[PDB]
């Protein structure tokens, strides 16, 4: 068996869209507010997250069929899934050799003590890194990583969505591509599709813990003033 | 004639408060988002203004009698006067020799082309710099500069204020100190008190032009997303 023309273009579109919105050199990180090592890391990491939100929106607008949903569902899917896509995309910078995200030199090497210096407890950090080492060990191809991101974004189980049918249809066309891709171009993984879908549930739980800790931060005005307008809009309740 | 004990402490309090909230080395400017020279300067200058707002609030809380107004009037006086105090305080960095604000090296030397790269037209820049060279030529002592800032903040003609009597009383005690100070410790300026009060009207007009151009910027979402939460709160209508 094989992939059809349409499943091809969907792979072509998602891989191009990822290359357009992910810079493996992390060169724009020199435009953030610099890191400091009292919550010293919060301005740099807020800038980083805010940058990453702009990137996921770009990815999103290039997922075939996403542009066709109403503006409400696009906003609805983006507000609730962004932190999860950011956690997924950040796997590309996560090194097993040091359990940090290595986005450059000692400046943009984010270890575990820097996440806590951004006002986040171990309750988030402990399953987050275990998700990173679990995801890293999967050794996903480029296409699977990008298909996983789009499947994540297109979950119909998100607050706000109204076209339960239309977005549940896109998410299933995308799973059909991913299931086909693993069949054709990935031996050594009969449960690879199951362990990936597993990761999507892992993210639901990481999403909850992060949004709990963010909520606390966004009500401490001395901290919310360190965030950006995009961060405050994407992660704040605005229906 | 002489200054009384109370007019002394008010001078002592305002000069100390200024030294606590103005750093002549501008060393925190390395924590902003860096400058770029399409509105390239806007992130750095938004950070700079946002930093300066935190400083003026500090000055404000140490102006004798300010802490006694209700929270509403403090917010009311700060929201409408902050940009004017920032323009005043920025005179300490304005060099006649180059008509720029020289806050350090070539990085933090803000010339006229950098203000326009922050989305501000010549309609603001042309009277703003003329205010800076007019103010600079006055060669004000430290005490007069700081008295002028507090008098500016304490204008009863600001939108929102409710204790027209209480804040009009503080602003007049402050003018009484400034008028006394110039009499005792400043010869060569019989119209110095008149030319200073003149500058307060100059600021009212600069304030209008800046808040017009800001309003336009804060409704272009691609630009408002470059601002900080403090900037958006202080300069946005929130009653």
């Amino acid at each position: 068996h094989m992939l059809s023309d349409e499943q091809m273009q969907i792979i072509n579109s998602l891989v191009e869209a990822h290359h357009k919105t992910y810079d493996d050199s992390y060169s724009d990180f020199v435009r953030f507010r610099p890191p400091v090592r009292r919550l010293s890391m919060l301005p740099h990491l807020a800038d980083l997250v805010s940058y990453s939100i702009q990137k996921v929106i770009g990815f999103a607008k290039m997922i075939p069929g996403f542009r066709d949903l109403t503006a409400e569902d696009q906003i609805a899917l983006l507000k609730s899934s962004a932190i999860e896509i950011i956690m997924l995309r950040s796997n590309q910078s996560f090194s097993l050799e040091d359990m940090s995200w290595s986005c450059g030199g000692p400046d943009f090497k984010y270890c575990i003590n820097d996440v806590t210096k951004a006002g986040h407890t171990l309750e988030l950090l402990e399953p987050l890194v275990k998700f990173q080492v679990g995801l890293k060990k999967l050794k996903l191809h480029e296409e699977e990583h990008v298909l996983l991101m789009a499947i994540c974004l297109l979950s119909p189980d998100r607050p706000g969505v109204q076209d339960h049918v239309r977005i549940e249809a896109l998410q299933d066309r995308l799973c059909d591509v991913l299931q086909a891709y693993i069949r054709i171009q990935h031996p050594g993984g009969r449960l690879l599709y199951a362990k990936m879908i597993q990761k999507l549930a892992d993210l639901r739980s990481l999403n909850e813990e992060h949004s709990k800790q963010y909520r606390s931060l966004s009500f401490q005005p001395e901290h919310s003033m360190q965030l950006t307008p995009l961060v405050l809009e994407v992660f704040g309740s605005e229906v | 004639h002489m200054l009384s004990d109370e007019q002394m402490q008010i001078i002592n309090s305002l000069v100390e408060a200024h030294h606590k909230t103005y750093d002549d080395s501008y060393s925190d400017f390395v924590r902003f988002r860096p400058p770029v020279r399409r509105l390239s300067m806007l992130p750095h200058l938004a950070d700079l203004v946002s930093y300066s707002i935190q400083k003026v609030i500090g000055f404000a809380k140490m102006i004798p009698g300010f802490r006694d107004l209700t929270a509403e009037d403090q917010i009311a006086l700060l929201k409408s006067s902050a940009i004017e105090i920032i323009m005043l305080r920025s005179n300490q960095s304005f060099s006649l020799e180059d008509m720029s604000w020289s806050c350090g090296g070539p990085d933090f030397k803000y010339c006229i082309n950098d203000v326009t790269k922050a989305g501000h037209t010549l309609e603001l820049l042309e009277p703003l710099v003329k205010f800076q060279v007019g103010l600079k030529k006055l060669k004000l002592h430290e005490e007069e500069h700081v008295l002028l800032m507090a008098i500016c903040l304490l204008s009863p003609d600001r939108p929102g204020v409710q204790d027209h009597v209480r804040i009009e009383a503080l602003q007049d005690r402050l003018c009484d100190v400034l008028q006394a100070y110039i009499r005792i410790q400043h010869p060569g300026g019989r119209l110095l008190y008149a030319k200073m009060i003149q500058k307060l009207a100059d600021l009212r007009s600069l304030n209008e032009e800046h808040s017009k151009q800001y309003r336009s910027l804060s409704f272009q979402p691609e630009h408002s997303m470059q601002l900080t939460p403090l900037v958006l709160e202080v300069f946005g209508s929130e009653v």
Partner: peptide, 9 residues
């Protein structure tokens, strides 16, 4: 949602 809306062009 001002910014998010504009960012979706």
């Amino acid at each position: 949602h001002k910014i998010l809306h504009r960012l979706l062009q």
